[PDB]
Amino acid sequence: MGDDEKKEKKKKSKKKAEEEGGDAPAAPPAPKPPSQKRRAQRSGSNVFAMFTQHQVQEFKEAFQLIDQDKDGFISKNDIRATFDSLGRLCTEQELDSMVAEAPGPINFTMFLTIFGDRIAGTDEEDVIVNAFNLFDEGDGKCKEETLKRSLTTWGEKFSQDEVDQALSEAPIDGNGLIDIKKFAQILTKGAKEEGA
Amino acid sequence: MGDDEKKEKKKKSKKKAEEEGGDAPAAPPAPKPPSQKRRAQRSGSNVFAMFTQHQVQEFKEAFQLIDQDKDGFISKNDIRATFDSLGRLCTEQELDSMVAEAPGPINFTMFLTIFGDRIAGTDEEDVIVNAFNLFDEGDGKCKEETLKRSLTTWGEKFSQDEVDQALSEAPIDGNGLIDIKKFAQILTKGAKEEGA
Amino acid sequence: SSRFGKFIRINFDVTGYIVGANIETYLLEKSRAIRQAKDERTFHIFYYL
């Protein structure tokens, strides 16, 4: 019991994260033990308060062209619908990776924690931006050749196929891959185009 | 397999627009090899204040104000007795037509289905300041002679009647119809009731 | 799928008849309840209640 809170959140958690280990297969993902909701709480997470006056109502300011359940929602059946019609995606493999930001009602009182989960969900800035911003030294960046040396020679070694695809793609910007932006392409303050 | 996700994509409808408005489209995505549905984005959500923060709040929450008998739809008798509960009533015909701005069951969604989609009407107030604020030669005012002479003579013309009505309402001071206030006089957080 | 497996002892008197009989089972998939993998489920009954 409280598994009722967790059936409403086997709906909504599941919003994080049970099928997430997609193409990199079948990981040790989000757990059913209730304390672990706060490991799903990792850094990159801001959630504005309930009678927000509005950073939460800004989600009404776009609401119209997103929702499912309009007494006012986006359910399981709406990222296991909407992302296929709004931001990205999922194989049964990556199913509730992205659909793990709604396996259960994104009510307005959950739009709250979906632009919350936008500035949160997938390993956000403190993880992604800092993956290389911590290898980095300062008001800086990381060297191209040294990052080639990494991707192949450091850790789980990758293929030629993997390097070439991530080479033509790499934002090489002055002999150095603009790491902060290779990650935060996904973030800042000037776009209202994708995800939502 | 790779399919059960795609089974689920159809409950969006079952409470948003479609159960009135197949008009406002379910947009088919999800081609079975689920690498594919990363092409289906709605890229670019910006213009002037679509949800304006003192207006569309109220409209939607005036579903919780305009649904009087608390059924979940809006009847002919909802709009009426709820306007009567404020004051100025439409006749049943005026109401009938104002309901017939949608095909029938104006419920919580059909209401906002016509509400948001209608993006056009009058000019914005800051454009309306530009109206006479672009005629002034400095920081100053507008000489009254010039506002009288223009409204009658220039381009689209008024009648005497048309000016005199506008003139008892027109805040003349120092032989100068200080335009900035008259603009706010016509169109600020304006009057209720007339729609929905 | 099931996850359990078993044994019997059969004690006999002076004349050899069935008198004692002793069944034992060995081990279980006893672990998942507090860690289910993505797209897996738990022990049947929870979901049912």
Short mmCIF file of C-alpha atoms in Angstrom, two decimals:
data_model
loop_
_atom_site.label_atom_id
_atom_site.label_comp_id
_atom_site.label_asym_id
_atom_site.label_seq_id
_atom_site.Cartn_x
_atom_site.Cartn_y
_atom_site.Cartn_z
CA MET A 1 0.00 0.00 0.00
CA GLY A 2 1.44 3.46 -0.77
CA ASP A 3 2.02 1.32 -3.81
CA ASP A 4 -1.24 3.24 -4.54
CA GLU A 5 0.84 6.44 -4.60
CA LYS A 6 3.12 4.05 -6.57
CA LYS A 7 0.29 2.76 -8.90
CA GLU A 8 -0.54 6.39 -9.63
CA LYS A 9 3.25 6.40 -9.90
CA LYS A 10 3.60 3.11 -11.74
CA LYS A 11 1.92 5.46 -13.90
CA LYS A 12 4.02 8.54 -12.82
CA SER A 13 7.30 6.68 -11.75
CA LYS A 14 7.92 4.92 -14.22
CA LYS A 15 8.10 8.75 -15.02
CA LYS A 16 11.73 7.73 -14.39
CA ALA A 17 12.75 5.22 -15.62
CA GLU A 18 12.06 1.54 -15.99
CA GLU A 19 12.91 0.59 -19.61
CA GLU A 20 15.61 3.28 -19.99
CA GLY A 21 18.54 0.97 -20.86
CA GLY A 22 17.70 0.89 -24.54
CA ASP A 23 20.31 0.34 -27.28
CA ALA A 24 22.85 0.04 -24.52
CA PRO A 25 20.72 -2.86 -23.17
CA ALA A 26 18.77 -3.72 -20.05
CA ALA A 27 20.53 -1.70 -17.36
CA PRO A 28 20.03 -1.70 -13.54
CA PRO A 29 17.41 1.11 -14.01
CA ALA A 30 15.03 2.93 -11.56
CA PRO A 31 13.99 0.79 -8.51
CA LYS A 32 10.60 -0.02 -6.98
CA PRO A 33 11.88 0.57 -3.32
CA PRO A 34 10.35 3.98 -2.38
CA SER A 35 13.46 5.74 -0.90
CA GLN A 36 15.15 5.56 -4.29
CA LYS A 37 12.80 8.23 -5.70
CA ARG A 38 15.64 10.37 -4.34
CA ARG A 39 18.31 8.83 -6.54
CA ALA A 40 16.11 9.62 -9.44
CA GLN A 41 16.76 12.97 -7.77
CA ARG A 42 20.09 13.68 -9.22
CA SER A 43 21.46 17.12 -10.04
CA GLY A 44 20.01 19.12 -12.83
CA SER A 45 16.53 19.34 -11.23
CA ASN A 46 14.50 22.59 -10.57
CA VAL A 47 10.83 22.41 -9.58
CA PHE A 48 8.95 25.63 -8.93
CA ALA A 49 6.32 25.82 -6.16
CA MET A 50 2.59 25.01 -6.50
CA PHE A 51 0.70 28.38 -6.54
CA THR A 52 3.61 29.56 -8.64
CA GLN A 53 2.01 32.78 -9.91
CA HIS A 54 4.19 31.64 -12.95
CA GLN A 55 7.18 29.82 -13.77
CA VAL A 56 4.80 26.85 -13.61
CA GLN A 57 1.96 28.54 -15.55
CA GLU A 58 4.39 29.18 -18.50
CA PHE A 59 3.44 25.60 -19.34
CA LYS A 60 -0.15 26.88 -19.81
CA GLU A 61 1.42 29.56 -22.04
CA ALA A 62 2.19 26.75 -24.45
CA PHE A 63 -0.35 24.15 -23.09
CA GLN A 64 -2.71 24.10 -26.01
CA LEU A 65 -0.57 22.44 -28.63
CA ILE A 66 0.79 19.67 -26.31
CA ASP A 67 -1.75 18.13 -23.99
CA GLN A 68 -3.84 14.97 -23.77
CA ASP A 69 -6.34 14.92 -21.11
CA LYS A 70 -7.92 18.22 -21.22
CA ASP A 71 -9.25 18.58 -17.93
CA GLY A 72 -5.60 19.20 -18.53
CA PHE A 73 -2.94 16.49 -18.86
CA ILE A 74 -0.43 14.31 -20.83
CA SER A 75 -0.82 10.63 -19.50
CA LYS A 76 1.21 7.35 -20.12
CA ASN A 77 -0.92 7.32 -23.21
CA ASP A 78 0.47 10.80 -23.90
CA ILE A 79 4.24 10.38 -23.89
CA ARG A 80 3.32 6.90 -24.96
CA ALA A 81 1.72 9.36 -27.24
CA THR A 82 3.00 13.08 -27.28
CA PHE A 83 6.83 12.73 -27.72
CA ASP A 84 6.27 10.90 -30.97
CA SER A 85 4.39 14.13 -31.75
CA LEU A 86 6.51 16.77 -29.79
CA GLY A 87 10.13 16.08 -28.61
CA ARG A 88 11.95 12.64 -29.09
CA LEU A 89 11.61 8.94 -28.80
CA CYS A 90 11.61 5.32 -28.09
CA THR A 91 11.94 1.82 -29.29
CA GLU A 92 10.44 -0.84 -26.74
CA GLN A 93 14.11 -0.89 -26.01
CA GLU A 94 14.26 2.94 -25.34
CA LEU A 95 10.54 2.80 -24.48
CA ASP A 96 10.25 4.36 -21.10
CA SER A 97 13.51 6.14 -21.42
CA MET A 98 11.79 9.12 -22.99
CA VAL A 99 8.36 7.64 -22.28
CA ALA A 100 9.68 7.58 -18.69
CA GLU A 101 8.83 11.26 -18.58
CA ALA A 102 5.24 10.19 -18.75
CA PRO A 103 4.10 6.64 -17.98
CA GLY A 104 1.19 8.31 -16.19
CA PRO A 105 -0.64 11.69 -15.95
CA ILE A 106 1.31 14.82 -16.53
CA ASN A 107 -1.57 16.80 -14.99
CA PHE A 108 -0.97 20.63 -15.04
CA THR A 109 0.10 19.65 -11.53
CA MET A 110 2.84 17.61 -13.25
CA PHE A 111 3.44 20.02 -16.20
CA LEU A 112 4.95 21.64 -13.17
CA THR A 113 7.35 18.72 -13.02
CA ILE A 114 7.74 18.13 -16.75
CA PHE A 115 9.28 21.42 -17.58
CA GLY A 116 10.54 20.53 -14.14
CA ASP A 117 11.54 17.17 -15.77
CA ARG A 118 12.83 19.22 -18.81
CA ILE A 119 15.22 20.96 -16.43
CA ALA A 120 15.95 17.73 -14.70
CA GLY A 121 15.15 14.37 -16.47
CA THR A 122 17.99 13.02 -18.65
CA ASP A 123 21.48 13.70 -17.02
CA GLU A 124 21.11 17.49 -17.16
CA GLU A 125 23.81 20.21 -17.05
CA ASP A 126 25.65 19.21 -13.80
CA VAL A 127 26.14 15.87 -15.48
CA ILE A 128 26.15 16.49 -19.29
CA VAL A 129 27.81 19.96 -19.47
CA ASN A 130 30.26 19.00 -16.76
CA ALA A 131 31.20 15.60 -18.31
CA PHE A 132 33.92 17.49 -20.18
CA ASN A 133 33.69 20.89 -18.36
CA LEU A 134 35.38 19.02 -15.51
CA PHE A 135 38.16 17.53 -17.72
CA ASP A 136 38.56 21.12 -18.81
CA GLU A 137 40.72 23.52 -16.88
CA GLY A 138 38.96 26.93 -16.65
CA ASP A 139 37.39 29.49 -19.09
CA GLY A 140 38.24 26.81 -21.59
CA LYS A 141 37.47 23.80 -23.78
CA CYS A 142 39.14 20.47 -24.74
CA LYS A 143 41.58 19.65 -27.55
CA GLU A 144 40.27 17.81 -30.61
CA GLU A 145 43.13 15.28 -31.03
CA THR A 146 43.12 14.56 -27.31
CA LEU A 147 39.38 13.88 -27.49
CA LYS A 148 39.95 11.48 -30.43
CA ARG A 149 42.63 9.82 -28.26
CA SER A 150 40.00 9.48 -25.51
CA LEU A 151 37.04 8.06 -27.35
CA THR A 152 39.02 5.20 -28.75
CA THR A 153 41.82 4.61 -26.17
CA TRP A 154 40.00 5.38 -22.85
CA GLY A 155 37.77 2.83 -21.25
CA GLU A 156 35.25 0.80 -23.23
CA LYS A 157 37.09 1.34 -26.53
CA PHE A 158 34.89 2.42 -29.47
CA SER A 159 35.07 1.58 -33.21
CA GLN A 160 36.11 3.55 -36.31
CA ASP A 161 32.39 3.66 -37.18
CA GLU A 162 31.68 5.29 -33.88
CA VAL A 163 34.50 7.87 -34.21
CA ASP A 164 33.72 8.95 -37.83
CA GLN A 165 30.04 9.48 -37.10
CA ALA A 166 30.94 11.45 -33.94
CA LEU A 167 33.71 13.27 -35.84
CA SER A 168 31.73 14.84 -38.69
CA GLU A 169 29.27 15.70 -35.97
CA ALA A 170 31.72 17.04 -33.35
CA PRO A 171 31.50 20.92 -33.02
CA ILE A 172 35.18 21.48 -33.73
CA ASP A 173 35.52 25.09 -33.00
CA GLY A 174 39.09 26.32 -32.94
CA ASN A 175 41.06 23.01 -32.72
CA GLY A 176 38.84 22.05 -29.84
CA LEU A 177 35.45 20.51 -29.47
CA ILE A 178 33.00 22.99 -27.87
CA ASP A 179 32.05 20.56 -25.20
CA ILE A 180 29.84 22.82 -23.03
CA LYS A 181 27.80 23.46 -26.17
CA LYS A 182 27.96 19.82 -27.57
CA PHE A 183 25.91 19.06 -24.48
CA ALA A 184 23.99 22.37 -23.90
CA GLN A 185 22.83 22.52 -27.52
CA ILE A 186 19.93 20.92 -25.61
CA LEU A 187 19.33 23.91 -23.14
CA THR A 188 19.72 27.72 -22.78
CA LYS A 189 17.37 30.77 -23.31
CA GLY A 190 16.23 31.65 -26.85
CA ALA A 191 14.27 28.81 -28.45
CA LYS A 192 10.75 27.31 -28.10
CA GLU A 193 11.16 24.61 -30.81
CA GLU A 194 11.47 21.02 -29.41
CA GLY A 195 10.88 19.25 -26.12
CA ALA A 196 8.35 20.30 -24.28
CA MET B 1 7.47 -6.30 -30.47
CA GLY B 2 8.50 -2.66 -30.62
CA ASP B 3 4.72 -2.36 -30.92
CA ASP B 4 3.13 -2.04 -27.46
CA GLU B 5 4.30 1.52 -27.20
CA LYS B 6 2.50 2.23 -30.47
CA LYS B 7 -0.72 0.51 -29.30
CA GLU B 8 -0.94 3.06 -26.53
CA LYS B 9 -0.56 6.22 -28.70
CA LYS B 10 -4.36 6.50 -29.22
CA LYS B 11 -5.72 7.58 -25.76
CA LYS B 12 -4.63 11.23 -26.36
CA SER B 13 -7.93 11.72 -28.09
CA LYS B 14 -10.06 10.13 -25.38
CA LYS B 15 -9.83 13.28 -23.36
CA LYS B 16 -8.48 16.18 -25.50
CA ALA B 17 -9.64 17.91 -28.58
CA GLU B 18 -10.58 15.18 -30.94
CA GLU B 19 -13.79 14.09 -29.18
CA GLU B 20 -15.11 17.34 -30.41
CA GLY B 21 -12.52 18.44 -32.93
CA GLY B 22 -11.00 16.03 -35.28
CA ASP B 23 -10.71 19.60 -36.63
CA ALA B 24 -7.66 20.04 -34.33
CA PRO B 25 -5.66 17.06 -35.66
CA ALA B 26 -4.26 13.95 -34.21
CA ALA B 27 -1.07 13.92 -36.30
CA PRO B 28 0.03 10.36 -37.31
CA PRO B 29 3.61 9.44 -36.23
CA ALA B 30 5.24 6.18 -35.01
CA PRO B 31 6.45 4.18 -38.16
CA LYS B 32 7.14 0.70 -36.77
CA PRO B 33 11.03 0.71 -36.83
CA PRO B 34 11.03 3.18 -33.92
CA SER B 35 14.25 4.91 -34.94
CA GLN B 36 12.00 6.76 -37.37
CA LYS B 37 9.69 8.97 -35.25
CA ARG B 38 12.48 11.54 -34.53
CA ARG B 39 11.32 13.48 -37.59
CA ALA B 40 8.05 14.53 -35.99
CA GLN B 41 8.72 17.82 -34.25
CA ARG B 42 6.73 21.04 -33.89
CA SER B 43 9.64 23.48 -34.32
CA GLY B 44 9.16 27.18 -33.35
CA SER B 45 6.58 28.23 -30.72
CA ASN B 46 6.87 32.14 -30.60
CA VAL B 47 4.93 35.29 -31.43
CA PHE B 48 3.54 38.17 -29.23
CA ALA B 49 1.88 37.07 -25.97
CA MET B 50 -0.40 34.26 -27.11
CA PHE B 51 -1.26 33.30 -23.57
CA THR B 52 -1.28 36.82 -22.27
CA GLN B 53 -0.86 36.61 -18.55
CA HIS B 54 -3.85 38.70 -17.73
CA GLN B 55 -6.39 37.05 -19.98
CA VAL B 56 -6.02 33.35 -20.89
CA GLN B 57 -5.50 32.41 -17.20
CA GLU B 58 -8.89 33.64 -16.51
CA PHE B 59 -10.62 32.24 -19.59
CA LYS B 60 -9.78 28.64 -18.78
CA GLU B 61 -10.49 29.11 -15.11
CA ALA B 62 -13.71 30.79 -16.14
CA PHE B 63 -14.56 27.27 -17.25
CA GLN B 64 -14.69 26.79 -13.46
CA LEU B 65 -16.53 30.09 -13.42
CA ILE B 66 -18.80 29.55 -16.54
CA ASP B 67 -19.80 25.92 -15.93
CA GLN B 68 -22.60 26.85 -13.53
CA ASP B 69 -24.49 23.56 -13.11
CA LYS B 70 -21.10 21.83 -12.75
CA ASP B 71 -21.63 19.13 -15.30
CA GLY B 72 -18.42 19.48 -17.32
CA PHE B 73 -19.87 21.01 -20.49
CA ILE B 74 -21.28 24.51 -21.14
CA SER B 75 -24.89 24.72 -21.87
CA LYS B 76 -27.00 27.54 -23.22
CA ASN B 77 -28.14 27.87 -19.64
CA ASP B 78 -24.56 27.94 -18.37
CA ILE B 79 -23.45 31.05 -20.28
CA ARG B 80 -26.72 32.81 -19.52
CA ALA B 81 -27.24 32.41 -15.75
CA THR B 82 -23.52 32.86 -15.20
CA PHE B 83 -23.71 36.16 -17.12
CA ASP B 84 -26.87 37.00 -15.10
CA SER B 85 -24.77 36.21 -11.99
CA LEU B 86 -22.51 39.07 -13.08
CA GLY B 87 -24.99 41.26 -14.94
CA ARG B 88 -25.56 41.88 -18.66
CA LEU B 89 -27.44 39.09 -20.30
CA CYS B 90 -27.39 38.10 -23.95
CA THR B 91 -30.76 37.03 -25.47
CA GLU B 92 -31.13 33.28 -26.03
CA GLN B 93 -30.57 33.91 -29.77
CA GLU B 94 -27.33 35.86 -29.14
CA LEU B 95 -26.32 33.04 -26.81
CA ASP B 96 -27.41 30.41 -29.34
CA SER B 97 -25.12 31.86 -31.97
CA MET B 98 -22.33 32.29 -29.43
CA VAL B 99 -22.67 28.55 -28.69
CA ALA B 100 -22.87 27.91 -32.45
CA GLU B 101 -19.42 29.40 -32.80
CA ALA B 102 -18.74 25.72 -32.12
CA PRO B 103 -20.61 22.60 -33.40
CA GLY B 104 -22.60 21.88 -30.21
CA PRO B 105 -20.94 20.37 -27.03
CA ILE B 106 -18.83 23.32 -25.84
CA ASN B 107 -17.21 21.48 -22.99
CA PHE B 108 -13.86 22.14 -21.24
CA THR B 109 -11.94 21.34 -24.44
CA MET B 110 -14.22 22.75 -27.29
CA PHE B 111 -14.27 25.97 -25.27
CA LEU B 112 -10.51 26.38 -25.45
CA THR B 113 -10.43 24.76 -28.91
CA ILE B 114 -12.11 27.94 -30.28
CA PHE B 115 -10.55 30.24 -27.68
CA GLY B 116 -6.84 29.79 -28.56
CA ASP B 117 -7.18 29.20 -32.33
CA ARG B 118 -8.82 32.62 -32.75
CA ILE B 119 -5.56 34.62 -32.69
CA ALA B 120 -6.88 37.69 -34.52
CA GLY B 121 -8.95 40.77 -33.72
CA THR B 122 -8.03 44.31 -32.68
CA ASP B 123 -4.52 45.83 -32.58
CA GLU B 124 -2.16 45.48 -29.56
CA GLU B 125 -2.01 48.38 -27.03
CA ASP B 126 1.69 49.08 -27.69
CA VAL B 127 0.81 49.39 -31.38
CA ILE B 128 -2.07 51.63 -30.27
CA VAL B 129 0.46 53.84 -28.34
CA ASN B 130 2.47 54.02 -31.62
CA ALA B 131 -0.72 55.29 -33.25
CA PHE B 132 -0.23 58.86 -32.04
CA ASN B 133 3.21 58.38 -30.42
CA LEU B 134 4.64 58.14 -33.96
CA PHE B 135 3.03 61.50 -34.99
CA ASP B 136 4.73 63.64 -32.29
CA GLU B 137 7.95 65.39 -33.41
CA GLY B 138 9.77 65.12 -30.05
CA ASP B 139 8.93 63.90 -26.63
CA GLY B 140 5.81 66.09 -26.26
CA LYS B 141 2.08 65.50 -26.90
CA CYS B 142 -0.37 65.94 -29.81
CA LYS B 143 -1.92 69.31 -30.65
CA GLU B 144 -5.64 68.94 -30.54
CA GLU B 145 -6.15 70.84 -33.80
CA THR B 146 -4.16 68.08 -35.51
CA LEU B 147 -6.23 65.23 -34.03
CA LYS B 148 -9.53 66.90 -34.93
CA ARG B 149 -8.39 67.90 -38.43
CA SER B 150 -6.99 64.43 -39.13
CA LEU B 151 -9.90 62.23 -37.92
CA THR B 152 -12.30 64.02 -40.18
CA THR B 153 -10.12 64.91 -43.21
CA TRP B 154 -7.48 62.24 -43.57
CA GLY B 155 -7.66 58.74 -45.16
CA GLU B 156 -10.57 56.91 -43.61
CA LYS B 157 -12.94 59.59 -42.42
CA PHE B 158 -15.30 59.97 -39.53
CA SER B 159 -18.62 61.81 -39.36
CA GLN B 160 -19.12 64.77 -36.99
CA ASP B 161 -21.06 62.35 -34.78
CA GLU B 162 -18.12 59.96 -34.84
CA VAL B 163 -15.69 62.66 -33.62
CA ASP B 164 -17.98 64.24 -30.92
CA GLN B 165 -18.62 60.86 -29.25
CA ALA B 166 -14.86 60.27 -29.31
CA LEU B 167 -14.36 63.88 -28.13
CA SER B 168 -16.37 63.89 -24.87
CA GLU B 169 -14.37 60.75 -24.07
CA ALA B 170 -11.11 62.38 -25.22
CA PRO B 171 -8.80 63.68 -22.39
CA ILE B 172 -7.98 67.18 -23.61
CA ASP B 173 -5.44 69.12 -21.53
CA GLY B 174 -3.33 72.18 -22.50
CA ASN B 175 -4.83 72.12 -26.01
CA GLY B 176 -3.19 68.72 -26.28
CA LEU B 177 -4.87 65.42 -26.36
CA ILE B 178 -2.19 63.52 -24.49
CA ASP B 179 -2.67 60.38 -26.42
CA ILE B 180 -1.05 57.76 -24.14
CA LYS B 181 -3.94 57.91 -21.67
CA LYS B 182 -6.82 57.71 -24.22
CA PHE B 183 -5.18 54.53 -25.57
CA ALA B 184 -5.30 52.90 -22.15
CA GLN B 185 -8.87 54.30 -21.75
CA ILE B 186 -10.04 52.25 -24.73
CA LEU B 187 -8.28 48.86 -24.30
CA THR B 188 -6.56 47.83 -20.95
CA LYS B 189 -7.84 44.89 -18.71
CA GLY B 190 -11.14 45.83 -20.38
CA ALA B 191 -14.82 45.17 -19.65
CA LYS B 192 -16.62 41.91 -18.86
CA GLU B 193 -19.14 40.44 -20.13
CA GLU B 194 -19.07 39.66 -23.84
CA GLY B 195 -17.40 36.29 -24.61
CA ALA B 196 -17.20 33.50 -23.63
CA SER C 1 7.99 -18.73 -14.84
CA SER C 2 8.30 -20.71 -11.56
CA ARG C 3 11.45 -20.65 -9.47
CA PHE C 4 11.56 -23.58 -6.80
CA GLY C 5 12.62 -27.36 -6.43
CA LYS C 6 12.26 -30.34 -4.05
CA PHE C 7 13.03 -33.72 -2.12
CA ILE C 8 11.36 -36.58 0.01
CA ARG C 9 12.39 -39.01 2.82
CA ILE C 10 10.19 -42.08 3.67
CA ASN C 11 10.63 -43.68 7.10
CA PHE C 12 9.45 -47.25 7.64
CA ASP C 13 8.47 -49.17 10.80
CA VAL C 14 9.56 -52.73 11.83
CA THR C 15 7.49 -54.39 9.10
CA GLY C 16 8.42 -51.85 6.39
CA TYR C 17 5.21 -49.87 5.94
CA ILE C 18 5.00 -46.18 5.20
CA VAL C 19 5.14 -44.36 8.46
CA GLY C 20 7.22 -41.13 7.96
CA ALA C 21 7.59 -38.90 4.89
CA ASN C 22 9.69 -35.76 4.64
CA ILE C 23 9.60 -33.29 1.80
CA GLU C 24 12.15 -30.50 1.35
CA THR C 25 12.46 -27.66 -1.20
CA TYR C 26 15.73 -25.83 -1.98
CA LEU C 27 15.93 -22.12 -3.17
CA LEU C 28 13.94 -19.22 -4.72
CA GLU C 29 14.16 -16.22 -7.09
CA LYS C 30 13.81 -14.27 -3.99
CA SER C 31 15.37 -10.97 -5.00
CA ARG C 32 13.51 -8.69 -7.48
CA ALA C 33 10.96 -7.04 -5.16
CA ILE C 34 13.27 -4.17 -4.32
CA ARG C 35 14.94 -3.93 -7.81
CA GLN C 36 12.73 -4.71 -10.94
CA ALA C 37 14.44 -4.26 -14.29
CA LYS C 38 12.94 -2.00 -16.95
CA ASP C 39 9.87 -3.65 -18.39
CA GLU C 40 9.91 -6.41 -15.71
CA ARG C 41 7.35 -7.00 -12.96
CA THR C 42 7.13 -8.18 -9.42
CA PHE C 43 5.53 -11.01 -7.48
CA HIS C 44 2.08 -11.67 -8.89
CA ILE C 45 -0.25 -10.52 -6.18
CA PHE C 46 0.62 -6.86 -5.55
CA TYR C 47 -0.74 -5.70 -8.88
CA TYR C 48 -3.82 -7.79 -8.19
CA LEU C 49 -4.65 -6.14 -4.78
#
